[PDB]
Amino acid sequence: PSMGTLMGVYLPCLQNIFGVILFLRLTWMVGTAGVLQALLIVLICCCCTLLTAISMSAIATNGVVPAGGSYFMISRSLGPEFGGAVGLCFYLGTTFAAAMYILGAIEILLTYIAPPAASNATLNNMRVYGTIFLTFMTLVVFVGVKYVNKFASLFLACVIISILSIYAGGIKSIFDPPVFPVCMLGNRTLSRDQFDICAKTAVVDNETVATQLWSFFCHSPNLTTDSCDPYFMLNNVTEIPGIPGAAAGVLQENLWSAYLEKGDIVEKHGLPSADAPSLKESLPLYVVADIATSFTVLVGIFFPSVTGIMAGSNRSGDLRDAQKSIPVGTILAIITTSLVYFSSVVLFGACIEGVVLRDKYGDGVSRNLVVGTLAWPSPWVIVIGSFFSTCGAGLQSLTGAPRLLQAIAKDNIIPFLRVFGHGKVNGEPTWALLLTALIAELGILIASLDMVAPILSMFFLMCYLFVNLACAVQTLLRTPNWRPRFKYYHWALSFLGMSLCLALMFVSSWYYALVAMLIAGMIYKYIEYQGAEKEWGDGIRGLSLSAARYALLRLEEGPPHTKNWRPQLLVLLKLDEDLHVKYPRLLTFASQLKAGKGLTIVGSVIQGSFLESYGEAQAAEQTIKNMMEIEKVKGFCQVVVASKVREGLAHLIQSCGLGGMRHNSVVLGWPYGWRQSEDPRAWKTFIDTVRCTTAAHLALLVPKNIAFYPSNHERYLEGHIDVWWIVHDGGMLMLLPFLLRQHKVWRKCRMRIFTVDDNSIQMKKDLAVFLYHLRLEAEVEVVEMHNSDISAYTYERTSNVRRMHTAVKLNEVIVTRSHDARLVLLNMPGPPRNSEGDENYMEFLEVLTEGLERVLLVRGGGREVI
């Protein structure tokens, strides 16, 4: 499969864009709204579609492009939810567009080609003929798709020849225009259909006689009468040319808005008219404004002529290089359409009279196509051209909507429309064509372009808005599979497009837009629910599972370092032989340090064998969950069954969490009665866990004397927290007391920073400035720093007899200056590298915290920033 850019993307988009709006409702819109507001409307209607094209290109470049069609790309790149929701709005837009083309073909057939073979009489004629055409076209679509696919080029050829003839006619108008006199009465517009000639009196047989216009306006067939309307006799009868050759005087005339009302009269601003009352038997003789015109009405009526940019990306499979051929083709088609509309708006505004443009059905002229008056070969080419264009566009929409419905139905996303996949032997849908025809019937029964157009606009605006919103969100939140390769693409453009198309969608009709948005939201949430039920098994619990998995997958990619550091704890509880929580104060302390916000996993090891001890593990899981719910700490609970507690602890420390939801702090208790008993298990297990948690670059919190920690019901009124930051680990040693006091239990305990040659003023200024950002502003008291005393910390981080001496002097200082303290925090030195000096390290740590009622030791990990 290989065809170029032109005949694969460009020409289909052109064939889909050029519609009936140009022929039937451009002149009326230009005359009613002027040239300025016309240019503003065209610009507004091209900007939304251009930003949507930018989003479509950004979608069409990331990754490979699926070869199925124009709906499969959207789904593959935005998820089944988005793709499914977009498909239905697009399907409805396409079927109503087919309906609108049928109405246009009927209107062009019954008004100019042949009116004899035909208020509400027109509405009934339109209804009947539109139903007959819809039936015949549906049957044709059933039987003869091959002939449509063969003849599809002809419709584009006719459109191109028509537009070329219009522009050539304009150029011939510039120096020698055609003649099409429109008659005037003062500053009113007479319907030229009835009268033979517009003149009050005519000369027959050497004398003057009343003309048909007189007898039609005056019921008397004798000139000698004075029972007629005052407007007829008071004013004159003029014949101004309707096609003034290109000049700057006409473009000066029709330059300001001319919004009429329902039932008003089409008036030629710039002719002498003396007002007067009038009878009621004359109204069937003036041309009348048919519908109320405004700005929003014109937006709604014109918009369906710039839609169809998603029909270009429809031969993805038979493309040479889609990444470079789809975006350029779409944007070139958009630009070409925008320039044709700009040029046509200016040409119409500046070349034709401002009063003959407002006859929607060409009443000023003798029931001709108002836009067909200027055309070189003959005014008869535009009628046939627009007829074939409307028929071809209707046929192609009726061919392309059921195929899309069958595609959506076989994907099995929405379950209640499984039947619509009952394709033919060849694959052509069977019970989807009937549904489409029924919807087309429901649309034809309205039988008025000016009322079908706003619904169509709502559907297409909804589709485009959803595409743009999806692109913007997926670019913002770093979706895992979303990286576009487009050069001129930035999510700000898609955001602006979403805003613009939403503004249009609400300008046209607020209630219609609300209904469309509610339908879209309902289908979106229903797709999400069904997908959850299909992946996992349950509805609500499935929703929660899907949200969790999506969030974790999105969090996987990206730099794995956070600019700030907050403790996320893993509380290692130690269950008893009877499966009871030994120290329920660790859970209380964890709840006080977290305050119910953050991540808190609670692991525990049970010695034995997994093969025969599963129920014990589950029972312990329930026990820990209950005890954890009581103390009001919101966290998960893991229980593992190991053979020896050492390896269980290791596997728990290095493997807990899912991807980015990892812990970064291990809070383990203190070993009690280690020196009393002869079994040395306790201290070796403790030191081994310490050595294993410092090699994983994790913080460490060892609350000593856990039997004196407060409960939640207790309250403190007088007391002062004590910090004894010695040398290193400053960030977390300063961050802990603040997070602690953030709880009501320590709500007002005074903080005192004690910091063990050097300069006290520079140090004080640094500590104070650092505290300024934190805002704790706690008093700083720096005691003397003796290098000989801290030798133990300096040598181990970066002498056994010396160890004890330094520890006893430090303990003396702290116990004489901080004995009555509430909580004492000091950073502990690292364990020795030699595996045998563990007894000395334990004796050091024990004689260091001798006397303090409540002492918590923290060891930094080294990757802490603040």
Ligand X SMILES: *[C@@H]1O[C@H](CO)[C@@H](O[C@@H]2O[C@H](CO)[C@@H](O[C@@H]3O[C@H](CO)[C@@H](O)[C@H](O)[C@@H]3O)[C@H](O)[C@H]2NC(C)=O)[C@H](O)[C@H]1NC(C)=O
Ligand Y SMILES: *[C@@H]1O[C@H](CO)[C@@H](O[C@@H]2O[C@H](CO)[C@@H](O)[C@H](O)[C@H]2NC(C)=O)[C@H](O)[C@H]1NC(C)=O
Ligand Z SMILES: *[C@@H]1O[C@H](CO)[C@@H](O)[C@H](O)[C@H]1NC(C)=O
Q: Token pair for residue 38?
A: 């016309």
Residues 295 and 32: beta-carbon distance below 8 Å: no
Q: What 3-state DSSP class applies to 575?
A: strand
Q: From the list 150, 269, 534, 765, which residue makes contact with ligand X (rule: CB under 6 A)?
A: 269
Binding partner of residue 572 among ligand ATP, ligand Y, its own copies, none, CB under 5 to 8 Å per kind? ligand ATP
Taking the C-alpha atoms of residue 78 and residue 484, their distance in angstroms, rounded to an integer, is 12
Count of C-beta atoms within a 10 Å radius of residue 58:
24
Out of 143, 175, 179, 272, the only residue in the binding site for ligand X (CB under 6 A) is 272
Place of tokens 């280690």: 674
Chain residues 164-193 in contact with ligand Y, contact rule CB under 6 A: 187
For residue 464, say whether it is annotated as part of any ligand binding site. Answer: yes
How far the first Cα of the chain sits from its last, in Å, is 60
Residue with tokens 């959506």: 408
Containing 337, the helix (H) or strand (E) segment is helix 322-351
User: Order of strands across the sheet with 188-189?
Assistant: 188-189, 181-185, 238-241
Per DSSP (E only), the strands in 629-707 are 636-637, 640-642, 657-658, 661-662, 665-667, 699-704
- Nearest CB to ligand ATP, comparing residues 517 and 682: 682
> Which of these ranges, 70-78, 242-250, 475-483, 664-672, lies near ligand ATP under the rule CB under 6 A?
664-672
In 3D space, the residue among 61, 83, 54, 58 whose CA is nearest the CA of residue 70 turns out to be: 83
From residue 275 to residue 304, the character string flagging contacts with ligand Y as x (rule: CB under 6 A) and all else as - is x-----------------------------
The residue range among 242-250, 362-370, 653-661, 663-671 that interacts with ligand ATP, by the rule CB under 6 A, is: 663-671
Binding mask 646-685 for its own copies (x = CB under 8 A): -xx-xxx-xxxxxxxx------------------------
Q: Which of 605, 641, 656, 845 binds ligand ATP (CB under 6 A)?
A: 605
Interface mask toward its own copies for 162-191; x: CB under 8 A: ------------------------------
C-alpha torsion sign, points 189, 193, 198, 201? negative
673 binds, among ligand X, its own copies, ligand ATP, none (CB under 5 to 8 A by kind): ligand ATP
Task: Tell me if 726 is assigned to a ligand binding site.
Answer: no
Do the Cβ atoms of 818 and 723 come closer than 8 Å? no
Q: Pick from 295, 376, 526, 536 the residue near its own copies by CB under 8 A.
A: 536
Tell me the per-residue interface mask from 172 to 191 with ligand X, x by CB under 6 A, - otherwise.
Answer: ---------------x----
The one among 267, 359, 528, 729 contacting ligand Y by CB under 6 A = 267
Question: Which is closer to ligand ATP, CB of 304 or CB of 603?
Answer: 603
Which of 142, 216, 672, 738 binds ligand ATP (CB under 6 A)? It is 672
Q: Do 387 and 105 touch, CB atoms closer than 8 A?
A: yes
Closer of 481 and 618 to ligand ATP (Cβ): 618
Residue count of the chain: 866
Assess contact for 95 and 545: CB atoms under 8 A: no
Nearest CA among 383, 404, 385, 382 for reference residue 393:
385
> CA–CA separation, 634 vs 597, rounded Å?
8
Burial of residue 511, with CB atoms counted within 10 A of its CB: 0-12 exposed, 13-18 middle, 19 or more buried: exposed
Nearest-angstrom CA–CA distance, 184 and 200: 12
CA atoms within 13 A on the CB side of 455: 19
What is the secondary structure of 401-446 as a DSSP string? HHHHHHHHHHTT-SGGG-GGG---SSS--STTHHHHHHHHHHHHTT
Q: Closest approach of Cβ 355 to ligand Z, in Å?
A: 18
Joined together, the tokens standing for residue 466 give 């959803």
Which residues would be at the binding site for ligand Z (CB under 6 A)? 236, 272, 274
Q: Tell me if 642 contacts its own copies by CB under 8 A.
A: yes
The answer to whether 776 touches 770, Cβ cutoff 8 Å, is no
* Binding partner at 236 among ligand Y, ligand ATP, ligand Z, none, C-beta below 5 to 8 Å by kind: ligand Z
Binding residue per annotation — 572?
Answer: yes
**Amino acid letter, residue 670:** W
Binding mask 546-575 for ligand ATP (x = CB under 6 A): --------------------------x-x-
Out of 273, 316, 344, 689, the only residue in the binding site for ligand Y (CB under 6 A) is 273
Residue 238 forms beta bridges with which residues? 184
Residue 652, contacted partner among its own copies, ligand Y, ligand Z, none, CB below 5-8 A by kind: its own copies
DSSP 10: I
Nearer to ligand Y, 269 or 765 (CB): 269
- Minimal distance in Å, beta carbon 252 to ligand X? 15
Out of 201, 278, 638, 811, point to the residue binding its own copies (CB under 8 A): 638
Q: Cα(518)–Cα(511) distance, rounded to whole angstroms? A: 11
188 versus 803: smaller Cβ distance to ligand Z: 188
Long-range contacts of 157-163 (CB under 8 A, 24+ apart): 158/384, 158/385, 158/388, 158/389, 158/392, 159/15, 159/18, 159/385, 159/389, 161/381, 161/385, 162/23, 162/381, 162/382, 162/385, 162/386, 162/389, 163/18, 163/340
The nearest distance, CB 339 to ligand Z, in angstroms, is 44
Residues 573-612 that bind its own copies (CB under 8 A): 597-599, 601, 610-612
Out of 107, 253, 267, 864, point to the residue binding ligand X (CB under 6 A): 267
Q: From ligand ATP, ligand X, ligand Z, none, which one binds at residue 269 (CB under 5 to 8 Å depending on kind)?
A: ligand X
Site string for its own copies, 460-499 (x = CB under 8 A): -----------------xx-x-------------------
Near ligand X by CB under 6 A: residue from 191, 273, 338, 592: 273
Contact call for residue 233 and ligand X (CB under 6 A): no
- 574 marked among binding-site residues: yes
Kindly state the smallest distance separating residue 840's Cβ from ligand ATP, in Å. 18
507 versus 645: smaller Cβ distance to ligand ATP? 645
Does 235 engage in binding with ligand Y (CB under 6 A)? no
Distance, CA of 662 to CA of 659 (rounded, Å):
7
Q: How many residues bind ligand ATP (CB under 6 A)?
A: 15
Instruction: Based on the shown chain and the rule CB under 8 A, indicate whether residue 556 belongs to the binding site for its own copies.
Output: yes
Does the protein bind ligand X through residue 275 (CB under 6 A)? yes
CA distance 444 to 395: 15
**Whether the Cβ atoms of residue 190 and residue 198 lie closer than 8 Å to each other:** yes
Amino acid letter, residue 602: V
Tell me the two tokens of residue 659.
Answer: 């991807």
Angstrom distance (rounded) from CA 542 to CA 553:
16
Select from 116, 272, 558, 673 the one that contacts ligand ATP (CB under 6 A). Answer: 673
CA distance 62 to 326: 12
304 is in an annotated binding site: yes
Radius of gyration of the chain (CA): 42
Which parts are annotated binding residues for ATP? 572, 574, 582-583, 605, 669-670, 672
Which parts are annotated binding residues for K(+)? 16-17, 101, 304, 307
The site for ligand X (CB under 6 A) is made up of: 187, 234-236, 267, 269, 272-275
Which parts are annotated binding residues for chloride? 308-310, 464
The site for its own copies (CB under 8 A) is made up of: 477-478, 480, 506, 510, 514, 535-538, 540-541, 543-545, 547-549, 551-556, 558, 562-566, 597-599, 601, 610-612, 614, 617, 634, 636-638, 640-643, 647-648, 650-652, 654-661, 691-692, 695-696
The site for ligand ATP (CB under 6 A) is made up of: 572, 574, 582, 604-605, 645, 668-673, 682, 685-686
The site for ligand Y (CB under 6 A) is made up of: 187, 267, 269, 273, 275
Which parts are annotated binding residues? 16-17, 101, 304, 307-310, 464, 572, 574, 582-583, 605, 669-670, 672
